[PDB]
């Protein structure tokens, strides 16, 4: 989520909805007890809020900077382990968004400068070279051909 030499962080907010009683939130509560404070300390630029909902499935909502329409994401945390929850958190921390529009492959190089020496253009010498076919050649006939009568003579 870093840009401008690591000075702009795209993941801004994380809101974790959990149940204080449900067994499907046991991993989330374990994460709160043991790991949440360390994660916040190592990621001070993210605002983490915890909201309790007793009879609803646990989930995490991630909000990023910008208005690209990929800055809102939601991920259910039902029955995940603390390590898996941390893995999802790190994924979203390292992303600029949910990346609907990010494509694997393509040119793989985005640039503001196509060329530093200038693009290729037709020139008079090149367009004259393109008409090489119309120039005449000198047939290399090699040694002369002699008639049997001349050889006999």
């Amino acid at each position: 989520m870093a840009s401008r030499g690591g000075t702009l962080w795209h993941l801004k907010e994380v809101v974790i909805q959990y149940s204080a009683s449900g067994n499907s939130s046991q991993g989330l509560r374990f994460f709160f007890r043991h790991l949440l404070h360390r994660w916040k300390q190592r990621n001070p630029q993210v605002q983490v809020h915890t909201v309790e909902n007793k009879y609803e499935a646990p989930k995490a909502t991630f909000k990023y900077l910008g208005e690209r329409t990929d800055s809102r994401c939601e991920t259910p945390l039902k029955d995940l382990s603390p390590g898996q929850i941390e893995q999802i958190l790190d994924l979203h921390r390292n992303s600029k968004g949910d990346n609907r529009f990010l494509k694997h492959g393509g040119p793989r190089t985005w640039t503001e400068r196509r060329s530093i020496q200038g693009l290729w253009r037709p020139s008079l010498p090149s367009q004259l070279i393109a008409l090489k076919w119309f120039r005449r050649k000198r047939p290399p006939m090699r040694l002369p051909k002699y008639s049997p009568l001349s050889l006999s003579l």
């Binding site: 909902n53 009879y55 609803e56």
Partner: protein
């Protein structure tokens, strides 16, 4: 099928919210009431 999928989606949308009313629940009212009774069951005699 489509009807079952729609009914399941609506039930998933409503069943997890406390304090609903009969007019809000519609055809799912008895199921919602039984679900809330089961959820309360743990509070009896604390």
């Amino acid at each position: 099928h489509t009807e079952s999928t729609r009914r399941k989606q609506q039930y998933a949308s409503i069943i997890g919210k406390q304090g609903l009313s009969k007019k809000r629940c519609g055809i799912h009212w008895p199921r919602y009431r039984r679900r809330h009774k089961a959820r309360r069951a743990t509070k009896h005699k604390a």
